[PDB]
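Write out the bound-state structure for fe (ii) ion.
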Amino acid sequence: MKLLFRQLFENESSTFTYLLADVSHPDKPALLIDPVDKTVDRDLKLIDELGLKLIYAMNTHVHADHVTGTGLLKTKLPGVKSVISKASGSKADLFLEPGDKVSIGDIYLEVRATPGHTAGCVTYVTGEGADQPQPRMAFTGDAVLIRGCGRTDFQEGSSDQLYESVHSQIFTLPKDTLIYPAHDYKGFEVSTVGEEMQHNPRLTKDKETFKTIMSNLNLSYPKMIDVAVPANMVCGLQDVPSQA
Amino acid sequence: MKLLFRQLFENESSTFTYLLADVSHPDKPALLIDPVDKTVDRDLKLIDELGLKLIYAMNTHVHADHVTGTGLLKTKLPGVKSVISKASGSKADLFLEPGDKVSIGDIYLEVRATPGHTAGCVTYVTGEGADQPQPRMAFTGDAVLIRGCGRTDFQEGSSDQLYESVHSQIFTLPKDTLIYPAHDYKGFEVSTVGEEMQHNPRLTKDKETFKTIMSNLNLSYPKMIDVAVPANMVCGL
Ligand SMILES: [Fe+2]
Ligand SMILES: [Fe+2]
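---
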């Protein structure tokens, strides 16, 4: 295994997309996590410059803040498959269950179910096998953010469920495991399991304190959810053939 | 030596600030590269959470797009020293010459003179040695951006000088060396020397073509330069 890894940012929605590839493999097979429609051309230009073969375009969950790039990526690289959890209820080429593994050459990602922000959230974690990246890397979606977590008042979320998911599926990973979230609003880019267990002001509270604090934040209505969720439930696809 | 490394982003100016610390030393000594005034409180809070001792607040160059956080950091944390090139002509606690080293515990950076965007630009490269980061990391300021570079028509810059700086100081490093620029406007965060030598749209041309390309750019007047340069020449104070 030889990992090529890039974190990419979409400034309108503050979203991180992740590119992973096994560049030891003759085809340089690659995947994207949480690609955004707006940045598809950027992403494809980068994949071409680096000579990668994009196998999968995956989502951690159904996004409320942007439109998935997975559909457009399919319109543009025939052969790429979209991937999302079965639990999300969304359309995709491939559905994931907890415990599934996704492979790109010799590199693999384990799928952990981490619902709470939505019912469909998963966390992708690089494999624990002997030849895999060290430290492990966890792509936590909106379940754990750096020094925070996603809201739980829409998309069938639950604070109780989020707390249990994080403590059972993420904080059980080795402390040096890197945390790569789907969003960040403070200019931060990475954390670690150990660092979040020490410093995350949400998820280091006891369960009932976390639930109380969450319930009272008085967050505004999500500005894009009425557009983004329907679009993302159909893989970001259109119902008319593309023009031009 | 054990390197703790973070890249931090300031959205108003699209600036990257870099935190480096040697967490194997009993003080957990740290430095910041290109800190911004707006994000001083954030940077201090992170430094406090991680239990680090801020030693240096350094600039790659005199910034035209934001006001340096060096002066505010020195105010809040007496004892912190600001650092900048001697060639920049700006005020700082410590001036650097080409070939100088800056150390925090067992971690050190080499200073390479890379003027062209400005007369004072330097690139900080993590040091050579088995106890240093592998691959090496080059903090290139605005001399080399990911698939780009800064403009050369202000701050006593020069396209010819920028080309020579990049080719002699940056493209001579091992190809796997990481490039961490001071800004990005496309959502990219890192590149490598080998990638830029292959794919940088302007710096891969020959010198005269590079010069011609840079002269032909259609750019607006720098939006902050008459506030930022004066402030940054006096350490933000
Ligand atoms: Fe979300
Ligand atoms: Fe600059």
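---
The pocket of fe (ii) ion (ligand 1) is lined by residues A 61, 63-64, 117, 142, 150 (CB under 6 Å).
The two ends of chain B are 34 Å apart (CA to CA).
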